[PDB]
């Protein structure tokens, strides 16, 4: 029984970054040779587990964190990095194991006029602990003055939209991501 | 109640065909507890016999993981969740296969939970549960296993026929 990587790497629609999905994989015979040796994945680079010897070790549980982020912005899905994603949406530990593929998807995600369904947090108070999503969208007051929970001056809705279009550049096209974690 | 017997021999945790083994066994004429559903301790192993399930664990609470076996009319389900059941959180391993005098031996060694059923108890199945197990309850005769040396007479097709304490 080969566990379903095809249900994570071929899902019809991916989940925006601020509420990144997750799937637990256990009790399967998983092959990473099919994953590594494909020319589609425009990124594959990982840590403490070299890609050649992936399938010759077995762990207790393997996780899969999937989302969709800006093309340029994908450099922050890595330990030790800091920015918007790594500091407010998806933060990795320092001793990370498992690894991260990211293939362009502009033919699938973006549509003419815009695709607003992918959102990302923009304002917060404190940096995220690793592997800690938050969904609450209480208005962020930009200063000491409160605003009684209304979008206005010095108070903003913390979720703003990517809005892809196919005519954008590679620096702004949508790059689906998957982040395998190992026991 | 109390009773005595002559049985409790299973294949010595090893699947060789063919002998003397120093394993966890049940003394031949030992004190076995005739029952007519308390929470009995597990010790190192139990002999179970009756003429439809089991719950194993340490605290049998949500603080620790607990083993649960249930036999349907068509199917057996083995799950190890943090049972209270009232609430199921975590839920790690789940085993589903055909349902199990009916006599059983349960031992939990090296993170594996081994089952033998039917003397010469053939191995039913072993499970990579990987939890501590100290006390148990029946969802019958209950004995306890002892680490003593045995002599087992194989009968030209395996089939342990006679045994010697």
């Amino acid at each position, epitope marked *: 029984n080969l566990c379903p990587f095809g249900e994570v790497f071929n899902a019809t629609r991916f989940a925006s970054v601020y509420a990144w*999905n997750r799937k637990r994989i256990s009790n399967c015979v998983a092959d990473y040779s099919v994953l590594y040796n494909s020319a589609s994945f425009s990124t594959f680079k990982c840590y403490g587990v070299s890609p050649t010897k992936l399938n010759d070790l077995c762990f207790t549980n393997v996780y899969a964190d999937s989302f969709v982020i800006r093309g340029d912005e994908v450099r922050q899905i890595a330990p030790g990095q800091t920015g918007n994603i790594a500091d407010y949406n998806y933060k990795l530990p320092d001793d990370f194991t498992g690894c991260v593929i990211a293939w362009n998807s502009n033919n699938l995600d973006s549509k003419v006029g815009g695709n607003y369904n992918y*959102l990302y947090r923009l304002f917060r108070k404190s940096n995220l602990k690793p592997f800690e999503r938050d969904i609450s969208t*209480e208005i962020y007051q930009a200063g000491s003055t409160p605003c009684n929970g209304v979008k206005g001056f010095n108070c903003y809705f913390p979720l703003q939209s990517y809005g892809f279009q196919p005519t954008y550049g590679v620096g702004y096209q949508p790059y689906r991501v998957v982040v395998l974690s190992f026991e | 109640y109390t009773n005595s017997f002559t049985r409790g021999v299973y294949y010595p945790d090893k699947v060789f065909r063919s002998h003397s083994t120093q394993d966890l066994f049940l003394p031949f004429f030992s004190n076995v507890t005739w029952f007519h559903n308390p929470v009995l301790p597990f010790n190192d192993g139990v002999y179970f016999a009756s003429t439809r399930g089991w719950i194993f664990g340490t605290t049998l609470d949500s603080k620790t993981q607990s083993l649960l076996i249930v036999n349907n009319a068509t199917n057996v389900v083995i799950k190890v969740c943090e049972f209270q059941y009232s609430s199921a959180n975590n839920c790690t391993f789940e085993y589903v296969s055909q349902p199990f005098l009916r006599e059983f031996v349960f031992k939990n060694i090296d993170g594996y939970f081994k089952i033998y059923s039917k003397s010469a108890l053939e191995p039913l199945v072993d499970l990579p549960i990987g939890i501590n197990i100290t006390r148990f309850q029946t969802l019958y005769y209950v004995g306890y296993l002892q680490p003593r040396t045995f002599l087992l007479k194989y009968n030209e097709n395996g089939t342990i026929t006679d045994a010697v304490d």
Partner: antibody
Amino acid sequence: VQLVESGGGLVKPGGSLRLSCAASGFRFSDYYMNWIRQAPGKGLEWISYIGSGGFATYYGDSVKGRFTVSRDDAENSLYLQMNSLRAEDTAVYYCARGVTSYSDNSGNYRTDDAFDIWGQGTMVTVSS
Amino acid sequence: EIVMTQSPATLSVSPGERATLSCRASQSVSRNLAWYQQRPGQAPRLLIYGASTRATGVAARFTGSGFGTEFTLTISGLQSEDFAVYYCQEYNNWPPWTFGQGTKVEIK
């Protein structure tokens, strides 16, 4: 956990009407919301959809240009705007809610979009 | 445009029996389907989402299964309340979501 709707009534062909439903008992600003509808004695049909804070509007095939949906998160309220009405869209409009996230027993942080707790009906009859 | 068809016309089962329902999709959605029970005169109610998970206020006598294109729902031990119409709707994309045509369970 309480969706109460209002604004339903009788309209003439070619008019307009504005339905609304107010919710209480949860954080309203974190959930998808969207409007189902049911013709009299037929199967349910899906009509609108709003996202997590505007800028996500979608619509059905037969109501593409006539219906405007918008939500005011702070008031725990929701509105649907109906323009250039016709006669064969008489129905009983509901305002559902989608389970945005379902964290299962282990991991499985899956994002669903099924219509959990609904409202009552608001009969909307269109005739001359 | 994923056309869903259920097509048991009118299920006719006596109380206390274990009945099954069918919802066949034209394409692959593979985990995205829901089951609704709509008692006559009431608003509908969610039973299954994800094709296997039960809702909050549902008894264990409702079970559903399927993957890809064939989905089923099984009701065991009917009571008087459980004679209604049943729908299935698919949501494995953004744009229009289609509701199944609905089947009714009667008393025999």
